[PDB]
Write an enzyme that holds these catalytic residues in place. Sequence first.
Site, PDB file in Angstrom:
ATOM      1  N   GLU B   1       0.818  -1.211   0.000  1.00 26.52           N
ATOM      2  CA  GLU B   1       0.000   0.000   0.000  1.00 26.52           C
ATOM      3  C   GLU B   1       0.861   1.275   0.000  1.00 26.52           C
ATOM      4  O   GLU B   1       0.585   2.193  -0.767  1.00 26.52           O
ATOM      5  CB  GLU B   1      -0.996  -0.003   1.168  1.00 26.52           C
ATOM      6  CG  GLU B   1      -1.876   1.241   1.156  1.00 26.52           C
ATOM      7  CD  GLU B   1      -2.980   1.222   2.192  1.00 26.52           C
ATOM      8  OE1 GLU B   1      -2.949   0.367   3.108  1.00 26.52           O
ATOM      9  OE2 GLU B   1      -3.887   2.070   2.095  1.00 26.52           O
ATOM     10  N   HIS B  16       2.019   1.660  -3.968  1.00 32.77           N
ATOM     11  CA  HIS B  16       0.685   2.105  -4.370  1.00 32.77           C
ATOM     12  C   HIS B  16       0.481   3.595  -4.085  1.00 32.77           C
ATOM     13  O   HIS B  16       0.035   4.351  -4.961  1.00 32.77           O
ATOM     14  CB  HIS B  16      -0.366   1.247  -3.664  1.00 32.77           C
ATOM     15  CG  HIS B  16      -1.729   1.857  -3.624  1.00 32.77           C
ATOM     16  ND1 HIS B  16      -2.174   2.621  -2.565  1.00 32.77           N
ATOM     17  CD2 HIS B  16      -2.759   1.787  -4.499  1.00 32.77           C
ATOM     18  CE1 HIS B  16      -3.415   3.010  -2.799  1.00 32.77           C
ATOM     19  NE2 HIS B  16      -3.797   2.508  -3.961  1.00 32.77           N
ATOM     20  N   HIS B  20       0.016   6.741  -6.790  1.00 33.67           N
ATOM     21  CA  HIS B  20      -1.060   7.726  -6.885  1.00 33.67           C
ATOM     22  C   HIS B  20      -0.496   9.114  -7.169  1.00 33.67           C
ATOM     23  O   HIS B  20      -1.011   9.850  -8.028  1.00 33.67           O
ATOM     24  CB  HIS B  20      -1.870   7.744  -5.588  1.00 33.67           C
ATOM     25  CG  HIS B  20      -3.033   6.801  -5.572  1.00 33.67           C
ATOM     26  ND1 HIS B  20      -4.338   7.228  -5.705  1.00 33.67           N
ATOM     27  CD2 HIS B  20      -3.096   5.457  -5.400  1.00 33.67           C
ATOM     28  CE1 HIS B  20      -5.151   6.185  -5.639  1.00 33.67           C
ATOM     29  NE2 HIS B  20      -4.424   5.102  -5.444  1.00 33.67           N
ATOM     30  N   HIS B  56      -4.824   0.288 -10.781  1.00 38.74           N
ATOM     31  CA  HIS B  56      -5.246  -0.711  -9.814  1.00 38.74           C
ATOM     32  C   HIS B  56      -5.344  -2.109 -10.409  1.00 38.74           C
ATOM     33  O   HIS B  56      -5.184  -3.081  -9.668  1.00 38.74           O
ATOM     34  CB  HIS B  56      -6.528  -0.249  -9.137  1.00 38.74           C
ATOM     35  CG  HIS B  56      -6.244   0.802  -8.119  1.00 38.74           C
ATOM     36  ND1 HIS B  56      -6.017   2.118  -8.469  1.00 38.74           N
ATOM     37  CD2 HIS B  56      -5.986   0.714  -6.794  1.00 38.74           C
ATOM     38  CE1 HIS B  56      -5.696   2.803  -7.391  1.00 38.74           C
ATOM     39  NE2 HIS B  56      -5.684   1.979  -6.362  1.00 38.74           N
TER      40      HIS B  56
END
Lengths: 325, 325
Positions: B1, B16, B20, B56
Amino acid sequence: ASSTAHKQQDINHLLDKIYEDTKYPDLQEIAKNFNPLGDTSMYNDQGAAAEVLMKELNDHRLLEQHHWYSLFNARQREEALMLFAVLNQCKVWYCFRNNAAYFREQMNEGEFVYALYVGVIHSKLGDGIVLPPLYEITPHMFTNSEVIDKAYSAKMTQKAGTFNVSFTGTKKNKEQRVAYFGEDIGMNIHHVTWHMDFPFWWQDSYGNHLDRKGELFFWVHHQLTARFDFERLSNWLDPVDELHWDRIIREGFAPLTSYKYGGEFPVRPDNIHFEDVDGVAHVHDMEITENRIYEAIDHGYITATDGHTIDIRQPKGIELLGDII
Amino acid sequence: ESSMYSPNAQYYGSLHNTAHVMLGRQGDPHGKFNLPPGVMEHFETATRDPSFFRLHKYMDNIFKKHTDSFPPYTHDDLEFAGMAVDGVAIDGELITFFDEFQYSLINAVDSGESIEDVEINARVHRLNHKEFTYKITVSNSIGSDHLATFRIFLCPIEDNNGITLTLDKERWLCIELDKFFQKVPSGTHTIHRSSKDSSVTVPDMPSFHSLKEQADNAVNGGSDLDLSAYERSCGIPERMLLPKSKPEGMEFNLFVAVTDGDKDTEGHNGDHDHGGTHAQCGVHGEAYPDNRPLGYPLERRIPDERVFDGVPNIKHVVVKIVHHP
Ligand SMILES: *[C@@H]1O[C@H](CO)[C@@H](O)[C@H](O)[C@H]1NC(C)=O
Ligand SMILES: [Cl-]
Ligand SMILES: [Cu+2]
Ligand SMILES: [Cu+2]
Ligand SMILES: [Mg+2]
Ligand SMILES: [Mg+2]
Ligand SMILES: [O]
Ligand SMILES: [O]
């Protein structure tokens, strides 16, 4: 002997089992004994076309039998048109039939079939004849390789059969959604026959003018393009893009088809740039040619060999553009 | 994450979350133009961006390499002995449509000193669906009533090219529609489950105006405000339970796995209140109520569909969803 029945029968026999020496004894006798140079009064040109072709034959300059043929190949086309020119000069059917039988046994089969078709179409002697569908005369050119192989297997085993054709590609290939358009055997006959009726090699010295040919060239291909796009729209696809010489050709193609002689048709990968083709043209030559045509369109005139202007701001302009494009 | 639970953020970083920001800043990657952060840099806005789903899926495939590394489930892994799913049906047609929804924009505008508010609303079109009820007929031959977990997924039958998918090719595409725990009595009985009660979804939020009115009415008059009637805001909106589908209808596989509720809730309390959104949002202030891996039983490779077909407590049936435009 000039009756439609006999002319049709003669054409049927000439086109039967085209890759083998003729199995009809009467055609065999003609091919052995007929002399294309034996009576110049047979011809409207006093025998000149027959002399031209016989010299190429006697000098061993003609394409061998059992070899691929492409109308776009200059020398092979020239050879096919030498036979067309003979057939086109025959005054009476026996001249046409006898020359066709004679040269069937001497010339490449692809050249022969082409010349016989355009000869029938463009001679008054051909009036009333119905030409067999090319997909039964040269089935390799209309039938994928898998079905041909089954036909070969049927012949090897001496067992009759009927085999199902089922379109090239896979369902993963969205272009396969519209394969029924360009692979339709009748659509392909439409296309070859249009070009036989309106050949780019036509000269009016062959006997008559082909009215508005250059404009009909634009129109028949515009309609092929517009009809294909209607199939794409029917199948949830966008319209085709246009080709650009400096941009990638997105959609490749695997024909999965073969020549009778010459091997399998070549595949084109997806997403390739145009490369120069040795013996044909550089990609840049295509761009220059395109530029010159657009120069004429935007000038409103075509430039003659001596530089003078040929007006295209008139109804015949689109036809003259077809002539030069 | 990555999260603060990572045992080694110095080495593994934060793929992750950094992704973003990397994506969000691609309109001004060097800060030359002084643009603010992109929509990918807020959870409020990230899904507006198409690249959210490309990012994703990329991340999802990392997880999938791990989940694919385990041995496929066997018959003995999957069987809930003595529990058979006899039938799966839906009471009510599966129909989607768009309707209209309003929310206030007042907090976005500037109010003066001593300037009366005026009502300013936005109206959006949003997907919705009609209510329906699952009817799952189950035969319990264990000899006593048993707690069962009902796991309901919607799976594609074919892809966008019309290719029928194997179970292995479907499983990672399936969407969770429901998960619930229910005592199945001895014998044969039909479990009913309303679409409204899905543990995957929550209703539309009450408006700010409605919350103000209810709080103010309760405070004014000494009335105990109780809103224990509303749910959390975590959960797929109820209105989006079903995919849009097509006006012509589409068929999907409705996949139901009935699994051993005792085993699944061991160490918790199976027949207790787990709230309305435990499938993906868990239970506020409590352990996650289902011990099985998330995605069970579809989260491992299924190379051999015979294994699933031989398990009586798993059944899938074809359902049709129609969009009303
Ligand atoms: C070929 O097509 C016909 C009719 O569509 C069908 O009856 C036959 O079974 C097919 N053969 C094969 C091998 O699919
Ligand atoms: Cl019942
Ligand atoms: Cu053409
Ligand atoms: Cu994310
Ligand atoms: Mg021969
Ligand atoms: Mg050129
Ligand atoms: O996300
Ligand atoms: O996220």
